[PDB]
Design a protein around this ligand. Sequence first.
Ligand SMILES: COc1ccc(-c2ccc(S(=O)(=O)N[C@H](C(C)C)P(=O)(O)O)cc2)cc1
Ligand SMILES: [Ca+2]
Ligand SMILES: [Ca+2]
Ligand SMILES: [Zn+2]
Ligand SMILES: [Zn+2]
Length: 163
Amino acid sequence: MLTPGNPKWERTNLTYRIRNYTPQLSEAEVERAIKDAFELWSVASPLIFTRISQGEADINIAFYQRDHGDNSPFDGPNGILAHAFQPGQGIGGDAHFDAEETWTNTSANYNLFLVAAHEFGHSLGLAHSSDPGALMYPNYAFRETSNYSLPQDDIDGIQAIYG
Ligand SMILES: COc1ccc(-c2ccc(S(=O)(=O)N[C@H](C(C)C)P(=O)(O)O)cc2)cc1
Ligand SMILES: [Ca+2]
Ligand SMILES: [Ca+2]
Ligand SMILES: [Zn+2]
Ligand SMILES: [Zn+2]
């Protein structure tokens, strides 16, 4: 459940910045998906997340197409949905999303809130779970989002790292 090397943030109060947006959702919807994704982890740990739109944030969020500077290119529809970097300075903790995906806040692939929540797990130092119902499961599966709360295994995962 934990990323090898046990990379974790030394600070519990982290900032995130939405560098750009997918035009498939309104900016507010994107901001809501991201805000709610972070809250999932914050309510199960001592972690606090604050958004900033200027300056350097701990977790940069951005939608990119194919090659985007970090040598891990996106690949068009499906396949690689997004990826994040383990806790650390610079690009560490950042989360990138494939701009070529259909991004939604519905049951249709892919629900941004869910993918973001999952990616932030990586941003916080969590690895994949074998539990099919866990947010950190390796493959995407829609789950009702209207009242989504961190699944038990994911709560155990973040608690294991940050208490
Ligand atoms: C329960 O909610 C979810 C579960 C899994 C995923 C998810 C996210 C990304 C991928 S990925 O793009 O195929 N794999 C990424 C890797 C190539 C860099 P990653 O999951 O390690 O971030 C697969 C499933 C999203 C939401
Ligand atoms: Ca893709
Ligand atoms: Ca960063
Ligand atoms: Zn990237
Ligand atoms: Zn993952």
